[PDB]
Amino acid sequence: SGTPFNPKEEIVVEKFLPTEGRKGTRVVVYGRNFGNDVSKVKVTIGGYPAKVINVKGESLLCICPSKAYEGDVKVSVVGDDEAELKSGVCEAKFDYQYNYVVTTFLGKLYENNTKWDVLAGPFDDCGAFDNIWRMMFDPNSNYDDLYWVGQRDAFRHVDFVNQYVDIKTTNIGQCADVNFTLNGDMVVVDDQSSDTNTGIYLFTRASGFTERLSLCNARGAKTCAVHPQNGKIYYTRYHHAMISSYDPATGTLTEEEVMMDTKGSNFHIVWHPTGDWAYIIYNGKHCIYRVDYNRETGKLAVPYIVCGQHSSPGWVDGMGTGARLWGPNQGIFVKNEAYAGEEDEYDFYFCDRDSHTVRVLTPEGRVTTYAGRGNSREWGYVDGELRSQALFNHPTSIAYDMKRKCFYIGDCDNHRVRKIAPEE
Numbered sequence: 001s002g003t004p005f006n007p008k009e010e011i012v013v014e015k016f017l018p019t020e021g022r023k024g025t026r027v028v029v030y031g032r033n034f035g036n037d038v039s040k041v042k043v044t045i046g047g048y049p050a051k052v053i054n055v056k057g058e059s060l061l062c063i064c065p066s067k068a069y070e071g072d073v074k075v076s077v078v079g080d081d082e083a084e085l086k087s088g089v090c091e092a093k094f095d096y097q098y099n100y101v102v103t104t105f106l107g108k109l110y111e112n113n114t115k116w117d118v119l120a121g122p123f124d125d126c127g128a129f130d131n132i133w134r135m136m137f138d139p140n141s142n143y144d145d146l147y148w149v150g151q152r153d154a155f156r157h158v159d160f161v162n163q164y165v166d167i168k169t170t171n172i173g174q175c176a177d178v179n180f181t182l183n184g185d186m187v188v189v190d191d192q193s194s195d196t197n198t199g200i201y202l203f204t205r206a207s208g209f210t211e212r213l214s215l216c217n218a219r220g221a222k223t224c225a226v227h228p229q230n231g232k233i234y235y236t237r238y239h240h241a242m243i244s245s246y247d248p249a250t251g252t253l254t255e256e257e258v259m260m261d262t263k264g265s266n267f268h269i270v271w272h273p274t275g276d277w278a279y280i281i282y283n284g285k286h287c288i289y290r291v292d293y294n295r296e297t298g299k300l301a302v303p304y305i306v307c308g309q310h311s312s313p314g315w316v317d318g319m320g321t322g323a324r325l326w327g328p329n330q331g332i333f334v335k336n337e338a339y340a341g342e343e344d345e346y347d348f349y350f351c352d353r354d355s356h357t358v359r360v361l362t363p364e365g366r367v368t369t370y371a372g373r374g375n376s377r378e379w380g381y382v383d384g385e386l387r388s389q390a391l392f393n394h395p396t397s398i399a400y401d402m403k404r405k406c407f408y409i410g411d412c413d414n415h416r417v418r419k420i421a422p423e424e
């Protein structure tokens with residue numbers, strides 16, 4: 001104990017030690033007029049309650065809570081009726097430290113991870129997932145509706161408002177990719193073997209995505225990348241070495257937007273958010289190329305390699321074509337605040353399926369590993385610290401939730417959606 005609380009005087013929060021720390025850190029807060037009754041003092045760090053261990057008038061000992069990012073240290077004293085009498089806040093902010101960790105968001109298996117059921121259900125009771133192939137948020141849903149195609153397996157819909165994971169009936173045999181048009185309609189690619197059958201389907205936003213339309217025929221279609229200003233759907237077909245497009249506003253087909261140096265393989269195209277260029281992920285050839293967009297002509301330039309070596313799989317971080325990739329699958333652009341004001345404000349996070357990692361390609365062309373291959377192993381199922389502990393097994397799909405500030409990873413051979421976010 002110490003000096004009794006004086007209701008005439010302000011609470012002053014002078015300083016705290018240590019000045020930084022992680023959740024569970026014992027913090028001593030120093031100042032004036034904290035009183036000598038632990039049950040009557042309240043402490044928050046970054047807005048979150050901190051358990052108070054002792055109070056001695058001019059100091060108190062508390063435990064740093066999780067999620068203390070904002071860092072303001074506020075001390076309040078309440079009366080007998082538990083109403084706040086006084087509060088003070090420190091001028092200095094606590095530097096809350098935290099690691100990013102991999103956790104499991106959706107999917108449950110049984111019999112020591114060998115069996116699962118496939119069903120629509122609540123987040124807590126929705127079986128597990130056969131194939132989390134490519135993910136996409138509905139851009140008009142404010143991060144409340146996440147969808148994924150499953151190739152020959154189920155198409156799923158994660159509904160955050162209702163905390164439900166539905167199965168979408170598509171009547172499409174092999175759903176290879178999903179995107180949304182500028183009008184917000186859902187595009188789904190069917191990878192099928194006839195030149196005279198539909199390869200790109202649309203589900204209309206106006207029907208709540210229940211009404212399906214056929215956009216165009218395409219055999220062996222693999223990807224659907226919607227350009228953010230011109231709205232065209234850019235795609236590849238197995239038997240043709242080129243990028244093609246379909247314009248949903250006019251129905252115009254351009255068979256050869258540009259030649260490619262490879263066919264007969266899976267590709268995934270992702271537009272940079274500016275629309276100035278796209279990456280072409282060579283899923284089967286272990287490299288990523290870039291294709292530039294000329295705004296004046298509306299034409300694509302000759303694609304060029306950015307990282308990896310074509311047909312040379314490996315797990316090697318490094319610069320551009322000195323890096324090695326191994327089954328790069330889906331990637332997404334994520335804003336990096338360290339790049340604020342630079343020509344490129346985005347990093348490119350992608351799942352490297354066969355190295356069992358999430359990797360990053362930076363605008364200079366550097367490839368680094370963000371998560372996976374923990375515990376001195378390659379694949380597995382372990383949650384925890386990104387590089388020292390965590391293990392994936394064929395991570396394939398990826399989405400970034402800007403609202404909740406986390407990644408979702410479709411960890412295909414663990415049959416789960418994994419999350420990468422700050423530890424709580």
Ligand SMILES: [Cl-]
Nearest residue numbers: 118129130154
């Ligand atoms: Cl499923």
Ligand SMILES: [Cl-]
Nearest residue numbers: 225226270271
């Ligand atoms: Cl795209």
Ligand SMILES: [Cl-]
Nearest residue numbers: 303304305306
């Ligand atoms: Cl090249």
Ligand SMILES: [Cl-]
Nearest residue numbers: 343344345346
């Ligand atoms: Cl940018």
